[PDB]
Design a protein around this ligand. Sequence first.
Ligand SMILES: CS(=O)(=O)c1cccc2[nH]c3c(c12)CCCc1ccc(CN2CC[C@](O)(c4ccccc4)C2)cc1-3
Ligand SMILES: CS(=O)(=O)c1cccc2[nH]c3c(c12)CCCc1ccc(CN2CC[C@](O)(c4ccccc4)C2)cc1-3
Lengths: 296, 296
Amino acid sequence: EKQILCVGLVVLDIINVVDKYPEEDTDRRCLSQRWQRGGNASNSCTVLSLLGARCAFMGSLAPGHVADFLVADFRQRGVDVSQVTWQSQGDTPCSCCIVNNSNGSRTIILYDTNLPDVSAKDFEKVDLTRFKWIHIEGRNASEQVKMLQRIEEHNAKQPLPQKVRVSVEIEKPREELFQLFSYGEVVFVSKDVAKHLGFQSAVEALRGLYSRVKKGATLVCAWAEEGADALGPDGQLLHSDAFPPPRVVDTLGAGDTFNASVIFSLSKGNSMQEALRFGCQVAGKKCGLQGFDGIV
Amino acid sequence: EKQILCVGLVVLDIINVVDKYPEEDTDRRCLSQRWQRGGNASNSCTVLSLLGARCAFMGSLAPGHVADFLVADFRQRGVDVSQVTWQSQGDTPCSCCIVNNSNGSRTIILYDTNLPDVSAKDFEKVDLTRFKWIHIEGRNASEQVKMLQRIEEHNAKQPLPQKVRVSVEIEKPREELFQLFSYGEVVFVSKDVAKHLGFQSAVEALRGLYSRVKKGATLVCAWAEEGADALGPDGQLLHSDAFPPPRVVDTLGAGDTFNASVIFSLSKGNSMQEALRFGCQVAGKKCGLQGFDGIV
Ligand SMILES: CS(=O)(=O)c1cccc2[nH]c3c(c12)CCCc1ccc(CN2CC[C@](O)(c4ccccc4)C2)cc1-3
Ligand SMILES: CS(=O)(=O)c1cccc2[nH]c3c(c12)CCCc1ccc(CN2CC[C@](O)(c4ccccc4)C2)cc1-3
């Protein structure tokens, strides 16, 4: 019963739900406030655990009351925390999020600049035989490239059912990340990255970025209310319409819900078309709920 | 030596300093993030301690890691916490603040609705002989009115140097707070309260609200970059121009810096004109600094 490893960020999300987006220099009372475990790779673990998958998290944490709460939340959700890279120096990332109840918008201000990242040296200790899928949240690209090369070396010595499946996510429009396109069987590219590169649709983004992926890889792009699209080695464009809820209340973590649902579906042997549909269905349902718990 | 008691709110302020105000549904990294002890009465204690006054705080806290940090901060600053009302049930207030460093603006989203307030019964335990000044942050007006009546009864039996000096702040435009104008020798009314009552200037606000204050009392109204004004029993309008810093970087806690500095100056025997000037000088300096620490 092999696990799914998600390598990336874990952050304390201090979420304020408001009735209207605040105007600069004003004071208001929130409708509600919650302290939620966040970060793209950590949120993928939450969704994977809710779907019934055995999953592990690999990311950095600094000792303190914040890390204890985040670890206690991971444990309660049954996410394995043995690969956590404990840092003697630095600060656990923390974000302040504004969730607008009226349209489901999420405005994030993140503090994640004072913590050493998972190194290639740290990743060298990971027993790759306990994982069937490794998802890397694109962050410190130069070190993560070495982590991806290690999996490639491992998989070349393994028979087809013993090969670890690899997915990569390019979510932030940072130049350094673009070297990660070349790795993984599944590459997730955000609407934000695509729009920053000049793309006005998911189909445009897939055609424009496919030459960057590994030979035989599938490029995946979710475009919010326009749905989600994919392009694999057969050159066929795949699409699923979005499944918006009756009332969009919380879009915070919707992207991760999509990524984790696609990984879940693909790891179970479903096709890319089935994974695209499932991804839109689960993230769609998530957009009509506060947090993640109501998806199942 | 007698202390200055500030009765009111203590909040966990989570401050994100940004280079520009975030647009709804965007993601940004902060320039810096800090976990600062807030609340209006709580902030006045910080400024009073920095100025050299022996001050105490009276407010509610719920047990947890947040309260421990807030208490540890108060203690480190030499603010007496013996009058803190520990609540068995509820949550310590927490706000998420966006400080824009290009203009000094502060946007606050506060969670403070799940904690019992300091009662008149809790205030009955306060030894009024240990305090020369009691400042009340207007909140639960009906209970605070009984606290104010207790001080009045006490002072009537005391010789002039043994009477406790009383100030009240009316910061929030809540109807309930308007009964507090009738109490205290010094009444602080915010620009926000005045603008909500229809007043377009501090002078207009003072002439329109003076009939509400106690006989012999002084009404004080700070009007941000327009300075601060006052009106006492002699019917003379007093004014101090604002002292803006070279660069306005943080206005969070500016009003509390003004209030605490006026209290400090008045408790030392300075005139209202000298207190108004000092209040604008200290709050003005504070605005060019992140936090409070750089005022002295
Ligand atoms: C895999 S997926 O399910 O395709 C998906 C993945 C990641 C993110 C996603 N967002 C949304 C979806 C989605 C799909 C359906 C739900 C939905 C409804 C409405 C809006 C649009 N709203 C939400 C704030 C909004 O973007 C806004 C912007 C600026 C100001 C105010 C609101 C205007 C988006 C989504
Ligand atoms: C006792 S006191 O010192 O008089 C004082 C007491 C309480 C509050 C106070 N605010 C300000 C002062 C002040 C006075 C000096 C510093 C200052 C400079 C500039 C502005 C005006 N700026 C600050 C963001 C601003 O209010 C804004 C609004 C909306 C969008 C962008 C910026 C437009 C205010 C103050």
